[PDB]
Ligand binder design. Structure first.
Ligand SMILES: C[C@H]1CCCC(=O)CCC/C=C/c2cc(O)cc(O)c2C(=O)O1
Ligand SMILES: C[C@H]1CCCC(=O)CCC/C=C/c2cc(O)cc(O)c2C(=O)O1
Lengths: 264, 264
């Protein structure tokens, strides 16, 4: 049975969150769009293997929208790592395996380096380390223009799975619709510079499993592959692109379960 | 003024070849389809920076079809390298800069390791090191189905630019049509295990520049990025996919020129 509820943290945030299962903690951190319904299938499938899975909407996004402005403007990996630790504190999760894509990826690595005592192991997928102009320039349009542009980028360019992306349903797309402008304004200018991978030695011998999408163009995350190799970090591929928990839920869960078991 | 001629080597091959310019030798080795017209405008552009540029159809392909069966069956990088060195010998090219994509990449790296006195510097692009079943399963089909399958794969999947591909013209496309069957039977099963890149340390500190197509799916040549990094070899991107010299002649020619000038 899944817990769906909210919990507030001292930093001003009311987090919407979900929990299923018993066992060691696995925490699924959203990409920038902040929407945890994307993990819904996987939450069950990972739990069914003997884990306790927790996920949540990110500050300012979807049902965690009650939050002060600093938590969704000028966002950095260190801010987000701070927020996440706070919700693990409130939920009394002492030790956690963490997964994260994009700004979640930067976040999980930042958790790993910053809170080594809390983080049993981290999976990072497609960590953004470069300023992208076709993303930053979206922030100075109308909100409704940005929602139209980015709903299309997600759907046709980076879903990795158009049908699956669409099958998430109207409620999810209505929430994402409101997140697109918030994301555009708070994330793509400040997340890349914050990437905690500029120090290779801090990376080395850490329980970190990095992945990039099989179908993503080689240029988008080429730098991830070079970085993980220079630091001896395990680096591999998942099917799809930016959202393997959406396009390939079954392979995603198996991957989380199997990487988790390896570090238990 | 391009020389367009034929020269025979004592291993039984009559090569169709092209030469333009005056200056240090730059040799452009085709991909597995073996067709040198794909280089046409880059030949001119590179030579106009002070280089003699030579290129050639590969044995058993296009206008170099007059060759004994061993040169186009069970093909390996060591075999191709040995053929290329035989045509360089015939053209009295003693010290060459070499470009190669795909099996041509395997070949240029095999050239660099095997003939360091002969090779000023080597540029390899998208070097195949993995068995791919869909390529391999085409050998068993009838010539015409192989041509249909592979013509489509090149057009829609890996060209990096379908207009540029189509614009090669009917003559080129009719020589490729004959080459697909020859290529399917001779190359995909035996080229990858011959990849000369399993000895990382022999690549270390060599004059080698490796590239991958910016738009190629990350999975296709992820392994190239790993190997070059482990080995210290310069790795970067060219725009497009498997045929940068068709889809982006200008960036391609400038890249060959710059990289060559680095090694003079
Ligand atoms: C929202 C999602 C949309 C993905 C939209 C997209 O264009 C994929 C390109 C890869 C970059 C994603 C990204 C980059 C950043 O600097 C910060 C981020 O939070 C993201 C990110 O989360 O991407
Ligand atoms: C002909 C060209 C078609 C390119 C067709 C294509 O599917 C691109 C996939 C990358 C592999 C190319 C390749 C693989 C091998 O094992 C041997 C080869 O000679 C090639 C190669 O040359 O690819």
């Amino acid at each position: 049975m899944r817990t769906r509820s909210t919990i507030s943290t001292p930093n001003g945030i009311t987090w919407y969150y979900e929990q299923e299962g018993t066992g060691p903690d696995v925490v699924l951190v959203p990409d920038g769009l902040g929407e945890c319904q994307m993990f819904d299938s996987s939450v069950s499938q990972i739990a069914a293997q003997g884990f306790r899975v927790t996920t949540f909407d990110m500050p300012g996004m979807s049902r965690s929208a009650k939050a002060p402005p600093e938590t969704y403007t000028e966002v950095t990996a260190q801010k987000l790592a701070s927020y996440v630790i706070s919700v693990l504190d409130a939920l009394d999760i002492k030790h956690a395996t963490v997964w994260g894509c994009a700004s979640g990826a930067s976040t999980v690595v930042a958790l790993l380096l910053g809170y080594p005592d809390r983080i049993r192991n981290a999976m990072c997928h497609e960590l953004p380390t470069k300023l992208l102009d076709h993303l930053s320039n979206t922030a100075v349009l109308e909100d409704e223009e940005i929602s139209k542009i980015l709903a299309n980028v997600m759907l046709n360019d980076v879903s990795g799975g158009s049908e699956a992306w669409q099958a998430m349903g109207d409620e999810v797309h209505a929430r994402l619709h409101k997140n697109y402008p918030v994301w555009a304004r708070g994330y793509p200018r400040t997340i890349p510079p914050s990437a905690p991978v500029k120090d290779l030695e801090a990376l080395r011998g850490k329980p970190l499993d990095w992945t990039v999408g099989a179908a993503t163009p080689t240029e988008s995350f080429f730098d991830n592959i070079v970085t993980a190799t220079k630091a001896g970090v395990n680096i591999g591929l998942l099917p799809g692109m930016h959202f393997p928990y959406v396009s390939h839920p079954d392979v995603f869960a198996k991957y989380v379960v199997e990487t988790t078991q390896k570090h238990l």
